[PDB]
């Protein structure tokens, strides 16, 4: 795969992860718009800590999911800062 | 009624282009390969991701919000590279 | 280099919103339910799709390119409704 | 499902169908930009004819795929006409 094909595959997975999260009762479908910069930072650090935990437990199956979570929250905070 | 969900792709359409542009800028530099998701080991992709996450944390502590946007692109790319290595 | 693939989502982000807006306009009208993908049979969704495809062909033959855009929204929606019925 | 969730699912499938088509050697990754209105019309009618064939054969498994093809080519022509 070149970058573009990898990125297309990864975006589809990121989106599927977003779907699952927003499907939980009470969850905002637009965290990048609805949350403050501070809350988005806070959330991203939580996700990064979860990724570190998965690495420490050598939980590679869950590692894939945690990489998606981190990528999405990087995107959401980037989005918030890019309007700001 | 507004299709809030389509705002995801409005965001991703921009973010993915910025991630690629960031890959461009660095693919050139010493010790960088055009396909890290394929060329590097899982172990190297990990330590590189952790390095980038450390830089992101450092930007936050310095309150350097300008440079923070770039560090978010780097972390996303390295999540992507390791995800790719792990998924094929 | 340009990320040509992301142009797909730039297009879809607009098109999906227009499809929804078209659903809005017609969900109201007599003999229309808010959830045709759930409320109608496969057979009815089919004949409705075929009806919409016939209207699209009629717009093309009349060279009515303004109204053609609306007929494309209708066909896409009805492909979607039948796909949904078939997929759940 | 409400409209939004259905549409999210359908778009993901439309995109996966697009991926597969563009992966064929020689295929444009941007038919909506690279093709003329006439070629896009021509292509859409071909896809609609294929959908009709699938219905006539009662090939319901292939019917799902043909619905995606038709939706994508409706979108591509709409895109071309919406710039025009
Ligand atoms: Mg997580
Ligand atoms: Mg960095
Ligand atoms: Mg019509
Ligand atoms: Mg076909």
CA–CA distance, B83 with A17 (Å, rounded to integer): 13
Q: By a Cβ cutoff of 8 Å, what residues of chain B touch chain D?
A: 3-5
Give me the numbers of helices (H) and strands (E) for chain B, helices first please.
4, 0
Q: Nearest to residue C26, comparing CAs of C60, C51, C1? A: C51
Whether the Cβ atoms of residue D33 and residue D75 lie closer than 8 Å to each other: no
Q: What is the largest CA-CA distance in chain D?
A: 38
Whether the Cβ atoms of residue A7 and residue B21 lie closer than 8 Å to each other: no
Assigned token pair, A37: 């910069």
Residue in A1, A2, A7 to test binding to B, most B beta-carbons within 10 Å: A7
Architecture of the CATH domain A2-84: Orthogonal Bundle (1.10)
Q: How many CB atoms lie within 10 A of CB D9?
A: 17
The conformation of residue B34, written as its DSSP 8-state character, comes to S
CA–CA distance, D76 with C12 (Å, rounded to integer): 9
CA of C41 to the centre of ligand 4 (A): 23
Please state the three-class secondary structure of chain A as a single string: CCHHHHHHHHHHHHHHHHHHHHCCCCCCCCHHHHCCHHHHHHHHHHHHHHHHHHHHCCCHHHHHHHHHHHHHHHHHHHHHHHHC
Tell me the nearest-neighbour CA distance from D8 into chain A, angstroms: 9
**Domain layout of chain B by residue ranges:** 1-88
CA–CA distance, B21 with B13 (Å, rounded to integer): 13
Q: Which residues of B touch A30 (CB under 8 A)?
A: 4, 7-8
CA–CA distance, A39 with A56 (Å, rounded to integer): 26
Helical (H) or strand (E) element with D25: none
Helical (H) or strand (E) element with C3: none
Cβ within 8 Å, pair D1-C88: yes
User: 3-state class of B46 per DSSP?
Assistant: helix
The conformation of residue C34, written as its DSSP 8-state character, comes to S
Whether the Cβ atoms of residue C65 and residue D40 lie closer than 8 Å to each other: no
Q: Which chain B residue has the Cα nearest residue C25?
A: B1
Q: Which chain C residue has the Cα nearest residue B22?
A: C1
Ordered DSSP codes for D26-82 = T--S-HHHHS-HHHHHHHHHHHHHHHHHHHHTT-HHHHHHHHHHHHHHHHHHHHHHH
∠ CA D40-A4-A51, rounded to 5°: 135
CA–CA distance, A39 with A32 (Å, rounded to integer): 10
CA atoms within 13 A on the CB side of C36: 25
Assigned token pair, D58: 């009662």
Tell me the nearest-neighbour CA distance from C50 into chain D, angstroms: 9
Whether the Cβ atoms of residue B73 and residue B20 lie closer than 8 Å to each other: no
Distance of CA B29 to CAs A74, B24, B32, B55, C12, Å?
A: 24, 10, 6, 18, 35
Whether the Cβ atoms of residue A76 and residue A31 lie closer than 8 Å to each other: yes
Which of C8, C53, C84 is the closest to D6 by Cβ?
Answer: C84
Q: How many CB atoms lie within 10 A of CB C12?
A: 22
CA–CA distance, C52 with A71 (Å, rounded to integer): 41
Which of B8, B73, B83 is the closest to A10 by Cβ?
Answer: B83
Ligand index nearest the alpha carbon of residue C78: 3
CA of A69 to the centre of ligand 1 (A): 5
**Long-range contacts of range A44-48, CB-CB < 8 Å, 24 or more positions apart?**
A44/A70, A44/A73, A44/A74, A44/A76, A44/A77, A45/B57, A47/A73, A48/B53
Ligand index nearest the alpha carbon of residue D64: 4
Ligand index nearest the alpha carbon of residue D59: 4
Q: What is the largest CA-CA distance in chain A?
A: 38
Cβ within 8 Å, pair B3-C9: no
Q: What is the CATH number of domain B1-88?
A: 1.10.287.1080
Q: Nearest to residue C24, comparing CAs of C82, C64, C77, C79? A: C77
Q: By a Cβ cutoff of 8 Å, what residues of chain A touch chain B?
A: 1-4, 6-7, 9-11, 13-15, 18, 22, 29-30, 32-33, 41, 45, 48, 52, 55, 60, 63-64, 67-68, 70-71, 74-79, 81-82
Q: How far is CA A33 from the centre of its chain?
A: 15
CA–CA distance, B80 with C27 (Å, rounded to integer): 41
Residue in B6, B12, B13 to test binding to D, most D beta-carbons within 10 Å: B6
Cβ within 8 Å, pair C3-B16: yes
């Amino acid at each position: 795969m070149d970058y573009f094909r990898l990125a297309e595959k990864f975006l589809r997975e990121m989106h599927a992860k977003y779907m699952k999260r927003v499907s939980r009762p009470g969850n905002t479908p637009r965290p990048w718009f609805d949350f403050s910069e501070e809350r988005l930072l806070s959330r991203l650090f939580e996700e990064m800590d979860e990724l570190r935990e998965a690495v420490e437990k050598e939980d590679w199956e869950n590692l894939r999911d945690e990489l998606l979570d981190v990528a999405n929250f990087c995107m959401y905070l980037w989005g918030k800062l890019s309007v700001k």
